[PDB]
Amino acid sequence: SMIKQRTLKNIIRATGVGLHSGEKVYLTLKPAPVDTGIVFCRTDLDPVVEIPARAENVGETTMSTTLVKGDVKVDTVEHLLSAMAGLGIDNAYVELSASEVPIMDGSAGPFVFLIQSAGLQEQEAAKKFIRIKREVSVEEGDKRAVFVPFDGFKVSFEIDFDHPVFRGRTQQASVDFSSTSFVKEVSRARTFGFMRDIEYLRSQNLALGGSVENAIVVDENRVLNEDGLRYEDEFVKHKILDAIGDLYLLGNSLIGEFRGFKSGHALNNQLLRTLIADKDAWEVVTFEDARTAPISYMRP
Ligand SMILES: COc1ccc(-c2ccn(CC[C@](C)(C(=O)NO)S(C)(=O)=O)c(=O)c2)c(F)c1
Ligand SMILES: COc1ccc(-c2ccn(CC[C@](C)(C(=O)NO)S(C)(=O)=O)c(=O)c2)c(F)c1
Numbered sequence: 001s002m003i004k005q006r007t008l009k010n011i012i013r014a015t016g017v018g019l020h021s022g023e024k025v026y027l028t029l030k031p032a033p034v035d036t037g038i039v040f041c042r043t044d045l046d047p048v049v050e051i052p053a054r055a056e057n058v059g060e061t062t063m064s065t066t067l068v069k070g071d072v073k074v075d076t077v078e079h080l081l082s083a084m085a086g087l088g089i090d091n092a093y094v095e096l097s098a099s100e101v102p103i104m105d106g107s108a109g110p111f112v113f114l115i116q117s118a119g120l121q122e123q124e125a126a127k128k129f130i131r132i133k134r135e136v137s138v139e140e141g142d143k144r145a146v147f148v149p150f151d152g153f154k155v156s157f158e159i160d161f162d163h164p165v166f167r168g169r170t171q172q173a174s175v176d177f178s179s180t181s182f183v184k185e186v187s188r189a190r191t192f193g194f195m196r197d198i199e200y201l202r203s204q205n206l207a208l209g210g211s212v213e214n215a216i217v218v219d220e221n222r223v224l225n226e227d228g229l230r231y232e233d234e235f236v237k238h239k240i241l242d243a244i245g246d247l248y249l250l251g252n253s254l255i256g257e258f259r260g261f262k263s264g265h266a267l268n269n270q271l272l273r274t275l276i277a278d279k280d281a282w283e284v285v286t287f288e289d290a291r292t293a294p295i296s297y298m299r300p
């Protein structure tokens with residue numbers, strides 16, 4: 001059959017804390033109708049404030065991707081959006097009782113598990129993809145983010161940390177999702193930060209909730225997490241996870257390839273804004289036969 005839009009089959013609930021705010025937050029994922037997209041809702045406010053997870057609503061990009069509307073914000077959407085992109089969720093309401101998505105274990109793993117436990121539901125409408133037709137590149141300083149045409153979905157990333165835990169390590173990775181599993185090889189990669197910075201970050205109301213329980217905490221010459229890493233290249237794989245979530249602010253899955261060099265949330269969003277504006281570089285496509293498409297999804 002055609003590749004169909006997907007929503008949630010059952011309501012999902014999670015409790016956690018914001019990485020940056022440290023605030024306890026209740027998260028509720030609900031089914032939504034066709035062509036809704038992913039919409040965040042601050043249900044602690046009355047009336048609620050609803051913010052579509054779209055590039056035009058990105059307001060701040062310091063230490064996370066932040067959605068803004070009116071006077072209010074939804075912080076740190078990127079790991080949840082990465083899970084939703086990886087599983088092919090088109091339509092959902094994401095209710096939050098506070099300004100920041102819970103960090104969980106620092107990865108997209110817990111979201112992926114909660115969603116796959118509830119199950120997905122295909123809907124009677126064709127799933128829309130954005131296909132890259134022309135290269136689109138943005139740079140600032142030594143940072144670069146590029147979309148190139150590609151029959152599939154592929155993400156590559158390079159980091160370059162002048163730090164003894166990173167020098168001599170795997171700081172480049174490329175993941176082609178026709179041959180590598182998002183769930184198994186990307187979703188569990190945790191966020192990371194540096195112990196040196198924590199007093200400074202907290203002085204700025206950043207990382208107020210961060211610890212070895214929800215992040216890889218890197219000290220001057222060692223990783224502090226006594227239980228170790230999930231992947232030898234967990235740092236760069238997390239940057240790929242971040243990129244997938246930031247890219248999903250396009251509002252549809254991509255057919256194409258992303259390459260990032262020291263990119264971060266700010267430049268990811270500048271790439272999306274440039275792509276959207278460069279309309280002859282992309283097109284919206286659907287697939288009447290899942291068998292012939294360049295991307296495939298597991299059963300809902
Ligand atoms: C932002 O635009 C995106 C476009 C596509 C994907 C995407 C689509 C499908 N799949 C599943 C592949 C596969 C069944 C799998 O991973 N099973 O576990 S596979 C290796 O068997 O082909 C992915 O992973 C990732 C995405 F994340 C983002
Ligand atoms: C106990 O000392 C700590 C020091 C730092 C952190 C920490 C963790 C994550 N982050 C966000 C990373 C980043 C933007 C991201 O994952 N965004 O989605 S990243 C990898 O792209 O730099 C931070 O800023 C800071 C911590 F928890 C504890």
Ligand SMILES: [Cl-]
Nearest residue numbers: 134278280281
């Ligand atoms: Cl052009």
Ligand SMILES: [Zn+2]
Nearest residue numbers: 078079191242
């Ligand atoms: Zn991250």
Ligand SMILES: [Zn+2]
Nearest residue numbers: 278279280281
């Ligand atoms: Zn153009």
